[PDB]
């Protein structure tokens, strides 16, 4: 898993890979790691997919309950506080490193939660296994007040560094852009590893696998 | 009817009868008086002995709550003991959790809050005692009063007990801006003897305490040879 987040001129840009490996074997090739938290708060997650989905869904329902109560849009500091409280209450057994990013009346906001509960608010953050190979790119190319196109090029490039140089990441680039009004989530922003050496479709004319006894049930 | 049997029943005119009945029991207790003298506080209470074999020092109503704060309970003595123990639990926490002496007004607020949690529930009865809290923290001398209703109020000079009106008419004519504790321990003590009737109770005695700079800002009982004889 490799998740990056970049604060640009107005809003934030989050990116992630798609490969999910279940113990040294690629289980799914197009898993989605950019969850939803609010109309203006997205949350990438790295580590154990179980906890990353569980805590995100928990606080995502809590925020919805809350904004139905108050009536205002939800603040990213509330989501960050809920997440960090829950994570610290379990002493890191809930192993989900999260990148939480949204837009408020206070401008963009992009923070990162370690699995132990500690938070940092930075201009750009990266988490996951290929977090060292992706950060290497952001340090080399992040200038202040980038336009949306530049932030998306930068996030795609920072992901393609973890895609190619890390074994536990790759096969695609998920890039979501959050602004004050909208939030557009493009799934296949870049697919470098293209579908080479086409399949041969081995042909087995139905019946070659012997069957002993069959009960068909019409409905 | 039955609208005056429990503390959780508003009368037809929005009065909680049980608390008025409680305050009626304080209106019939021994006299107390107190003065906040801009450099210290002086509380003085009347002790009505029902027996002439009682050792001096029995049924003392003035209890120390912290180093600097004290409570004089005019009214039912056992209930005053509960309030004194609660104030002691509140003052030891601020000295334990917050490493600081409890400010007088905060102590009065907490004592009132505790006195009021007994006039909301159907299973309790309101305290039959009014407290006089005399404190001298780093915010100056403070004199507060709490009624069985749970309402606190800060005074310059306060009077309680059966003889409360005529004993209050004495405190109007003191100055309270130039009044010093060293003379207030005489003034208030004489006020109680003037207001005290002696063809009802043959045995009575005045007990006075104070906290000012002379006592190192500590709530202690007056030196014995500082109260006028009568």
């Amino acid at each position: 898993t490799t998740i990056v987040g970049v604060v640009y001129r107005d809003g934030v840009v989050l990116g992630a890979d798609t490969r999910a490996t279940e113990g040294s074997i690629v289980a799914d090739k197009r898993c989605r790691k950019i969850h939803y938290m609010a109309p203006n708060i997205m949350c990438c997650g790295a580590g154990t997919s179980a906890d990353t989905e569980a805590v995100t869904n928990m606080v995502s329902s809590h925020l919805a309950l809350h904004r139905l109560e108050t009536g205002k849009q939800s603040r990213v500091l509330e989501a960050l506080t809920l997440l960090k409280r829950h994570l610290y209450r379990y002493q890191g057994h809930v192993s989900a490193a999260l990148v939480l990013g949204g837009v408020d009346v206070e401008g963009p906001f992009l923070a990162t939660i370690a699995p132990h509960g500690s938070t940092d608010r930075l201009p750009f953050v990266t988490m996951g296994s290929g977090s060292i190979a992706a950060m290497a790119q952001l340090e080399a190319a992040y200038k202040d007040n980038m336009t949306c196109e530049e932030a998306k090029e930068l996030v795609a490039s920072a992901i393609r560094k973890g895609i190619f140089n890390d074994p536990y990441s790759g096969t695609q680039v998920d890039v979501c852009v959050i602004t004050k009004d909208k939030t557009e989530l493009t799934i296949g922003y870049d697919k470098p590893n293209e579908r080479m050496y086409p399949r041969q479709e081995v042909l087995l004319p139905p019946g070659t696998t012997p069957v002993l006894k069959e009960e068909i049930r019409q409905l | 009817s039955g609208h005056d049997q429990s503390t959780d029943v508003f009368s037809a005119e929005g009065r909680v009868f049980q608390v008025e009945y409680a305050g009626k029991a304080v209106d019939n207790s021994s006299t107390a008086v107190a003065a906040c003298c801009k450099d210290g506080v002086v509380v003085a209470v009347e002790k009505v002995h029902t027996s002439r074999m009682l050792e001096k020092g029995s049924n003392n109503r003035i209890h120390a709550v912290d180093r600097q704060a004290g409570i004089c309970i005019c009214g039912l003595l056992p209930d005053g003991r509960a309030i004194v123990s609660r104030a002691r639990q509140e003052a030891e926490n601020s000295r334990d959790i917050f490493a600081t002496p409890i400010r007088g007004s905060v102590l009065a607020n907490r004592v009132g809050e505790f006195m009021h949690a007994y006039t909301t529930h159907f299973a309790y009865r309101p305290f039959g005692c009014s407290a006089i809290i005399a404190s001298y923290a780093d915010d100056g001398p403070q004199l507060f009063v709490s009624d069985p209703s749970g309402t606190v109020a800060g005074y310059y000079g306060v009077a309680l007990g059966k003889a409360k009106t005529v004993a209050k008419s004495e405190l109007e004519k003191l100055d309270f801006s130039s009044l010093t504790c060293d003379e207030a321990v005489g003034k208030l003590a004489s006020i109680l003897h003037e207001v005290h009737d002696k063809q009802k109770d043959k045995l009575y005695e005045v007990e006075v305490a104070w906290v000012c700079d002379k006592s190192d800002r500590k709530f202690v009982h007056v030196p014995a040879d500082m109260v006028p004889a009568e």
């Binding site: - | 009368s11 009132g112 009021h116 159907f122 749970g150 309402t151 310059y156």
Partner: protein, 245 residues
């Protein structure tokens, strides 16, 4: 079928008599408060009369600060209000501790109304005989500015926003004066001095005594300084002399 009015039960015509008598406890102590909001600020004026002249004139109050940003006045049974504030304050800390932002004003009003509705349901508890008014300024969205807010919660829990509320003794005459004054001008366009003049004129119309400076305490929240704070007598005298004309 005999009592119907000593606990929390419905009486034949469909009323909760304990919540109908708790409205007579607020109007009992003879106090009266008026809260108003201009374009940029919220003001709350209350009678603060100590007829006794041995009592510290700065000990008993009505204005409390629930949060650094939200204040309140408590009309009615004096101790009740105090207790209520504590509850509110508690709910702030929890909220402040659990979500990481300072508690909004509408959320505080809704929760303090709900807490009031719980007592009107169980038989044991006695309903709080106090009409609470929380004043503050909240973050307005899509522009970031601060908008003034006045919220009222009754013994029943009938929370509601306001443009100008009056509570306590002779509150109907005060509301009538405010309504008549509103039919001409636009309250959400007035400035702080005019608004305070209207509040003081309403209060002097409801009691008819031409109050002096030491009988009223005024608390204010301003877009400039967002904190709740009470204004000195040297400022209230300037509004009294101006109403005098």
């Amino acid at each position: 079928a005999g009592f119907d009015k000593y606990i929390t039960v419905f009486s034949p015509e469909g009323s909760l008599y304990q919540v109908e008598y708790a409205f007579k406890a607020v109007t009992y102590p003879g106090l009266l408060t008026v809260a108003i909001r201009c374009k940029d600020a919220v003001l709350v004026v209350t009678q603060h009369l100590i007829p006794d002249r041995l009592m510290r004139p700065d000990s008993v109050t009505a204005l409390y600060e629930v949060t650094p940003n939200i204040g309140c006045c408590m009309t009615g049974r004096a101790p009740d209000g105090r207790a209520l504030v504590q509850r509110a304050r508690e709910e702030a800390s929890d909220y402040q501790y659990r979500y990481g932002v300072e508690i909004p004003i509408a959320v505080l009003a809704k929760r303090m109304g709900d807490k009031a509705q719980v007592r009107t349901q169980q038989a044991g508890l006695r309903p709080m005989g106090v009409v609470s008014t929380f004043i503050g300024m909240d973050q307005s969205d899509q522009d970031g500015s601060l908008k003034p807010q006045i919220y009222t919660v009754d013994p029943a829990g009938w929370t509601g926003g306001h443009i100008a509320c009056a509570a306590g003794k002779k509150q109907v005459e005060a509301m009538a004066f405010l309504e008549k004054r509103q039919k001409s001008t636009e309250l959400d366009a007035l400035t702080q001095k005019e608004a305070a003049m209207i509040a003081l004129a309403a209060l002097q119309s409801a009691i008819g005594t031409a109050v002096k400076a030491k009988e009223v305490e005024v608390g204010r929240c301003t877009a400039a300084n967002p904190a709740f704070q009470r204004v000195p007598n040297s400022e209230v005298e300037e509004w009294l002399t101006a109403v005098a004309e």
